């Protein structure tokens, strides 16, 4: 994995590790999941953290986050788990995630984005070139190696 792939995965870690203390707690994952219109119970939040927390101290540190991100063979979701993921982004239900919907989602994650940064984000998953992310395009970003 490239050194900039690491930096990118560091940037994602920053989204979860709200208080920047170098660990993600069940509390912080809670607040991320709620900021995306989701609603996990406390025990759900403990299941998620355990399946990454390799060393069993209750939290995710960056070395454990890097390992999650880096390492997974192919096997992947039901089109049901993907749909619910797609629907966090497709705020108005129309079938297309636009630049404005992504920007809104980022803001909720405490992320201070510029239009050009948003547009380049649309660019990585936009495949037909329409400036938006349909679901078929969403799948591929979620579902490929």
């Amino acid at each position: 994995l490239t050194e900039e792939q690491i930096a990118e995965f560091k940037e994602a870690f920053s989204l979860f590790d709200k208080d920047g203390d170098g660990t993600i707690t069940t509390k912080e994952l809670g607040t991320v999941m709620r900021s995306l219109g989701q609603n996990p119970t406390e025990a759900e939040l403990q299941d998620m953290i355990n399946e990454v927390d390799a060393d069993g101290n209750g939290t995710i540190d960056f070395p454990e986050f890097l390992t999650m991100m880096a390492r997974k063979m192919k096997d992947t979701d039901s089109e049901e788990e993907i749909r619910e993921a797609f629907r966090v982004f497709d705020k108005d239900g129309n079938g297309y995630i636009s630049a404005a919907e992504l920007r809104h989602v980022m803001t909720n994650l405490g992320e201070k984005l510029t239009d050009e940064e948003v547009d380049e984000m649309i660019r990585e998953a936009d495949i037909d070139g329409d400036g938006q992310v349909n679901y078929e395009e969403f799948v591929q970003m979620m579902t490929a190696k």
Binding site: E8, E11, A12, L15, V52
Partner: peptide, 17 residues
Amino acid sequence: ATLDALLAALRRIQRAD
């Protein structure tokens, strides 16, 4: 950060077993 990394993080973190 990268839609890629965000989605992957969210997808991989949600797996509860």
